[PDB]
């Protein structure tokens, strides 16, 4: 199908803002999301280390995770939409940490080949929540990997930007334990990034 790609920040904001006012999040839900934007790396890190099992977590965290999960009952995208994300080398694996990037800042083509072999046309499970943006915003111009997720109409997806502690990200959040299938991997025009196109599943 066709996936809406925002090409203008003000249009992205107005659409996102409009989605958000309809959500009708509870007070507790909003608090959990505000806190997630402050400490996402810790939360997602614990979810990956424990493969989605929250039983051992502190009770404040168990509560926070259940509230973020429950929030996606109210937060669905009303259309097919493209979402974006910047990632550092470790995203592809420990092996890529210090091998994806040449000294001059270009993508090493041999590491690109091991990444394409490892990931192209394959499913990937993510234990954490997935923070994305409505556009390829400048916050992740410095990042070597850009992923474009194709998110179907009716899929769980929420514009949480109005209540984020941080500005400028046009932030759309996706639920934890999502699987996506990597459809395409190519180098960018200047050779400094890998562009990944993926289809988001349940």
Curated annotation (Swiss-Prot):
Residues represented out of the complete protein: 44 to 245 of 251
Similarity comment: family membership: To exoenzymes 3 of C.limosum and C.botulinum C phage, and to S.aureus ediN.
Subunit structure: Monomer. Interacts with human RALA.
Protein name (database record): Mono-ADP-ribosyltransferase C3
EC number: 2.4.2.-
Annotated NAD(+) binding sites: 37, 44, 48, 85-88, 124-126, 140-143, 169-171
Listed result of changing residue 131 to A: No effect on enzyme activity
Effect caused by changing residue 139 to A: No effect on NAD binding. No effect on enzyme activity
GO molecular function, one term: NAD+-protein mono-ADP-ribosyltransferase activity
Variant or mutagenesis effect after changing residue 66 to A: Loss of interaction with human RALA
Keywords: Glycosyltransferase, Host-virus interaction, NAD, Nucleotidyltransferase, Secreted, Signal, Transferase
Result for mutant: residue 56 to D: Reduces interaction with human RALA
Site (Transition state stabilizer) residue list: 171
Domain TR mART core: 4-202
Active-site positions on this chain: 85, 131, 171
TM ranges: none
Annotated catalysed reactions: L-asparaginyl-[protein] + NAD(+) = N(4)-(ADP-D-ribosyl)-L-asparaginyl-[protein] + nicotinamide + H(+)
């Amino acid at each position: 199908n066709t996936y809406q790609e925002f090409t203008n920040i003000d249009q992205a904001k107005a659409w996102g803002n409009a989605q958000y006012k309809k959500y009708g999040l509870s007070k507790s839900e909003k608090e959990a999301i505000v806190s997630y934007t402050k400490s996402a790396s810790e939360i997602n890190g614990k979810l990956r280390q424990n493969k989605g099992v929250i039983n051992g977590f502190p009770s404040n965290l168990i509560k926070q995770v259940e509230l973020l999960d429950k929030s996606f009952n109210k937060m669905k995208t009303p259309e097919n939409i493209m979402l974006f994300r910047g990632d550092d080398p470790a995203y592809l694996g420990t092996e890529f940490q210090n091998t994806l990037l040449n000294s001059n800042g270009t993508i090493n083509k041999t590491a690109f080949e091991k990444a394409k072999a490892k990931f192209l046309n394959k499913d990937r499970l993510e234990y954490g929540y997935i923070s994305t943006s409505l556009m390829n915003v400048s916050q992740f111009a410095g990042r070597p990997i850009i992923t474009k997720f194709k998110v179907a109409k009716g899929s769980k997806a929420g514009y949480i930007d109005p209540i984020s502690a941080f500005a400028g990200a046009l932030e759309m959040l996706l639920p934890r334990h999502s699987t996506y299938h990597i459809d395409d991997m190519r180098l960018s025009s200047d050779g400094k990034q890998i562009i990944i196109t993926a289809t988001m599943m349940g």
